[PDB]
Write a sequence for this structure.
């Protein structure tokens, strides 16, 4: 059969591989990847404990708040340096790749078509939670994009698979 739903390590693993390459430059530049903004960033500190208080359906709604956050943070991230000056090599190139990943993610979660019942108003977190910390540097977004998926992605994937190899 195919590489399962999101239990396809090749896909998620690939997120880590990418954020890896991405991080190198946000931790190697000299001016870019470190502006003076103030964008919040999701807290990957979540755990199986506080995560369990979200049944399969709700669980999916939770990961959905996480990518929605990043959608905005990453959007401005592209914009500010595009519209403003921000010298140094074209950093935005990477902000397009990382962008496609969160996007495929959004469509992916909707792709298993399984328990998700992700139906809610236009909002989903972009108007209440935002219990995230501010960011005055890109080093955060990319590092976060490394830790973030290891958080909720692992959890969602656990449920995506919910069989392993029994």
């Amino acid at each position: 059969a195919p590489p399962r739903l999101i239990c396809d390590s090749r896909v998620l693993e690939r997120y880590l591989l990418e954020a890896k390459e991405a991080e190198k430059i946000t931790t190697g530049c000299a001016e870019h990847c470190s502006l003076n903004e103030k964008i919040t960033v999701p807290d990957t500190k979540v755990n199986f404990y506080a995560w369990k208080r979200m049944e399969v359906g709700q669980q999916a709604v939770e990961v959905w708040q996480g990518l929605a956050l990043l959608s905005e943070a990453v959007l401005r991230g592209q914009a500010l340096l595009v519209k403003s000056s921000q010298p140094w090599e074209p950093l935005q190139l990477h902000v397009d790749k990382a962008v496609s990943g969160l996007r495929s993610l959004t469509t992916l979660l909707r792709a298993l078509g399984a328990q998700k019942e992700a139906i809610s108003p236009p909002d989903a977190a972009s108007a209440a939670p935002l219990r995230t910390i501010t960011a005055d540097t890109f080093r955060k977004l990319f590092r976060v994009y490394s830790n973030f998926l290891r958080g909720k992605l692992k959890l969602y994937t656990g449920e995506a698979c919910r069989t392993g190899d029994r």
Q: What stands out?
A: The chain has one domain: 1-166. The chain is about 55% helix and 0% strand. The helical segments are 9-26, 48-51, 56-83, 92-111, 138-161. The radius of gyration is 16 Å.
